[PDB]
């Protein structure tokens, strides 16, 4: 769920930096 | 046409659809599915009107392949959210997916997981059917450029052997 919330919140700012998710912890 | 093709290429590829279909809710997935249905219907009508033949053939088929790969990948995950999302999105987009028969077969195989029964499983079943019922798709119009022609010749030889 934590990834879900962080993604919902980050959908506006840094969308194109999303390939790194890949069903894993948020790659920073 | 130039900037439009560039924008659509930047949207389709770069691997954004996969996660963006994980994040959003159910109805948001439905809406994005409607948008992709509209854009693909218009693109396919433009193609079948012969207007784009020079190099748009290869690029269009590449787009179709990349979208097929993205959906086949996202449709295979353990969470519940990804499964329900993929199911809704395909339930919207499958109305117009007259790609190569290879693609329809690939989606049919990927959806044919049939794991432990649940609500998602009950929903996936009608989404595995009602898309194999297309069985009308074109595969020749794509290309003969690569060595794939030799693989087609080998398959034709195997079929000829089978004919006996």
């Amino acid at each position: 769920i934590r990834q879900w919330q962080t993604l919902r919140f980050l959908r506006s700012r840094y969308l194109f930096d999303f390939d790194k998710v890949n069903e894993k912890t948020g790659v920073d | 046409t130039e900037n439009l093709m560039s924008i659509l290429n930047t949207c389709i590829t770069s691997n954004i659809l996969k996660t963006l279909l994980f994040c959003c809710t159910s109805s948001e997935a439905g809406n994005l599915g409607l948008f992709f249905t509209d854009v693909l219907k218009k693109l396919e009508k433009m193609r079948l009107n012969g207007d784009f033949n020079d190099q748009a053939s290869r690029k269009l088929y590449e787009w179709h392949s990349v979208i097929t790969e993205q959906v086949i990948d996202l449709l295979s995950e353990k969470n519940y959210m990804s499964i329900r999302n993929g199911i809704e999105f395909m339930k919207h987009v499958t109305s117009v997916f007259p790609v190569v028969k290879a693609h329809i077969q690939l989606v049919y195989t990927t959806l044919e997981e049939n794991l432990i029964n649940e609500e998602r499983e009950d929903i996936k079943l009608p989404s595995s059917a009602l898309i194999g019922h297309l069985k009308a798709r074109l595969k020749d119009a794509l290309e003969l450029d690569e060595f794939c022609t030799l693989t087609e010749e080998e398959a034709e030889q195997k079929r000829i052997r089978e004919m006996e």
């Binding site: - | 339930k91 009608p126 059917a129 009602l130």
Partner: protein, 361 residues
């Protein structure tokens, strides 16, 4: 709107949605997708699981209305079942104005059926009928079946076992185009017949106190509807007369009575018109009523299976309810003792102080 996954016509979808259908049963999802393509179907299912809806939705999908052309013919076994199938066709065709449906059964003047068939305002594309009357219409050329595309036979087992019925259905079948869609539906297809939460209590007392006791119980318990099971028709009718005399609106249904009034009162109480109904074991099985929340067994049955069939009228589809029984003789206590061993249920004695009303709602 599960039927929206069926990919059907939108007006038909609205006609189904206004019919309360929201999630298809197993047999619907298993048969409708393939019957839509025009393939023959032979269906066996448990009664009351929406077997009519399958072919109703199918024929409402495949039809393209042609004026004066009969393509869909359904054959049944009774006149009241024919009325029910035409009512189903009507509730399914709310949003389809061009399609017209009609029903044919005995007891009506054949000339009236003929003239309504000749009338363009009543020229039907869907005809539900009994095989004998529709045979009398085809053999007299009162109806034309030279363009039939859909042939449905409900309760096909009895249609094919009875000789007159099978001959009639075959005379109707031979007057239809051979390249048609064919469907048979029945809950019973033996091997012999084209590419197809409930609360349970009891009262142990003597007979002469029953009449006043219910007058107290039916006064204190908070209820939507109440059913009264009796073992005889005379006692039931008497108790209903007395209850209606008791400022308590009540109806009675049992045997020894004409079927017309039975259907009438049954349908009337189904619609929440009165709050008390009394019946013998004639409704021991098959009945489906939602709002019944409190049941009083005035007289116990002889066997445990009949008692469970009685109590099955309450707590429909795993819902909450309350049941209370009368014990006034030795065999009553005997069956009370046998029900617990078979059904693993403790039917405690009803306390005098009353039960919490929320324990059954």
């Amino acid at each position: 709107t599960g039927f929206k996954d069926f990919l059907l016509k939108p007006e038909l979808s609205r006609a189904i949605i206004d019919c309360g259908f929201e999630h298809p049963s197993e047999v619907q999802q298993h048969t409708i997708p393939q019957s839509i393509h025009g393939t023959d179907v032979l269906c066996q299912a448990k009664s009351g699981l929406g077997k009519t809806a399958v072919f109703v939705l199918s024929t409402l999908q495949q039809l393209d209305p042609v004026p004066g052309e009969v393509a869909v013919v359904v054959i049944c076994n009774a006149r009241e079942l024919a009325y029910q199938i035409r009512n189903e066709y009507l509730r399914f065709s709310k949003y389809m104005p061009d399609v017209k449906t009609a029903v044919f059964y005995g007891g009506t003047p054949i000339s009236k059926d003929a003239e309504l068939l000749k009338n363009k305002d009543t020229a039907p594309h869907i005809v539900v009928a009994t095989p004998g009357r529709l045979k009398a219409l085809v053999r007299e050329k009162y109806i034309d079946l030279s363009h039939v595309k859909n042939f449905v036979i409900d309760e096909c087992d009895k249609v094919l076992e009875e000789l007159d019925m099978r001959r009639d259905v075959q005379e109707i079948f031979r007057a239809t185009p051979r390249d048609k869609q064919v469907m048979m539906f029945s809950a019973t297809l033996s091997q012999e017949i084209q590419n197809p939460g409930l609360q349970q209590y009891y009262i142990k007392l003597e007979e002469r106190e029953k009449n006043r006791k219910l007058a107290q119980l039916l006064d204190d318990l908070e209820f939507n509807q109440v059913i009264i099971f009796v073992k005889s028709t005379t006692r039931a009718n008497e108790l209903t007369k007395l209850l209606n005399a008791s400022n308590f609106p009540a109806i009675t249904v049992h045997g020894h009575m004409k079927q017309e009034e039975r259907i009438a009162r049954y349908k009337a109480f189904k619609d929440f018109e009165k709050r008390i109904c009394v019946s013998t074991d004639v409704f021991g099985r098959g009945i489906d009523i939602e709002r019944i929340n409190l049941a009083i067994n005035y007289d116990l049955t002889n066997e445990a299976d009949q008692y469970l069939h009685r109590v099955g009228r309450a707590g429909r589809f795993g819902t909450k309810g309350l049941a209370i029984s009368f014990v006034s003789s030795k065999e009553d206590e005997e069956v009370l003792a046998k029900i617990q061993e078979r059904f693993d249920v403790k039917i405690a004695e009803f306390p005098e102080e009353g039960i919490d009303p929320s324990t059954y709602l």
